[PDB]
Amino acid sequence: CPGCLSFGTEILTVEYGPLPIGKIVSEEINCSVYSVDPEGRVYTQAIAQWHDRGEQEVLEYELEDGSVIRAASDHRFLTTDYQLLAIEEIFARQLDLLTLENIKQTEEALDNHRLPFPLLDAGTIKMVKVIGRRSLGVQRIFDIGLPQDHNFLLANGAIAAN
């Protein structure tokens, strides 16, 4: 599973705040995530499918802002130019990840505006590079199915594909 994330990957949920994808899938939690459309606007959508994909090769990617992403080398994330590329590629080409700097402040703003709302008007964006990685072997992976755009915001501000 290319678009799978490790158990502990924290997804920013509307109703409960950050929750590990493994928990969301293991309990098949009905909740919504924050996603970005092709026009770069943020909106919420409820999870439609919960997938427990067993195990596969997972790497730990260390980000410039200190956060970390544990996923398959080819998992895609949103870049500063609005391209969904494999994190390994983002590391290899030293591209910048388009991320939200302050989650709390961003969610607060989105609570007082009509959605979808421009991601850049929601909060301050930070362009962070992926500085390194290291194999973790084969680990437990999961994925959630969304009804609209196949991406969602992580607790660290990064936007992961699905």
Swiss-Prot record:
UniProt gene name: dnaE-N
Function: DNA polymerase III is a complex, multichain enzyme responsible for most of the replicative synthesis in bacteria. This DNA polymerase also exhibits 3' to 5' exonuclease activity. The alpha chain is the DNA polymerase.
Subcellular location(s) per record: Cytoplasm
Lineage: Bacteria, Bacillati, Cyanobacteriota, Cyanophyceae, Synechococcales
Note: The intein is a split intein capable of protein trans-splicing. The N- and C-terminal halves of dnaE are encoded by two separate genes located 745 kb apart in the genome and on opposite DNA strands. The dnaE-N product consists of a N-extein sequence followed by a 123-aa intein sequence (Ssp dnaE1), whereas the dnaE-C product consists of a 36-aa intein sequence (Ssp dnaE2) followed by a C-extein sequence. The N- and C-extein sequences together reconstitute a complete DnaE sequence that is interrupted by the intein sequences inside the beta- and tau-binding domains.
Protein name: DNA polymerase III subunit alpha
Family of the protein in this entry: Belongs to the DNA polymerase type-C family. DnaE subfamily.
Species in which this protein is naturally found: Synechocystis sp. (strain ATCC 27184 / PCC 6803 / Kazusa)
Quaternary structure, from the entry: DNA polymerase III contains a core (composed of alpha, epsilon and theta chains) that associates with a tau subunit. This core dimerizes to form the PolIII' complex. PolIII' associates with the gamma complex (composed of gamma, delta, delta', psi and chi chains) and with the beta chain to form the complete DNA polymerase III complex.
Modified how: This protein undergoes a protein self splicing that involves a post-translational excision of the intervening region (intein) followed by peptide ligation.
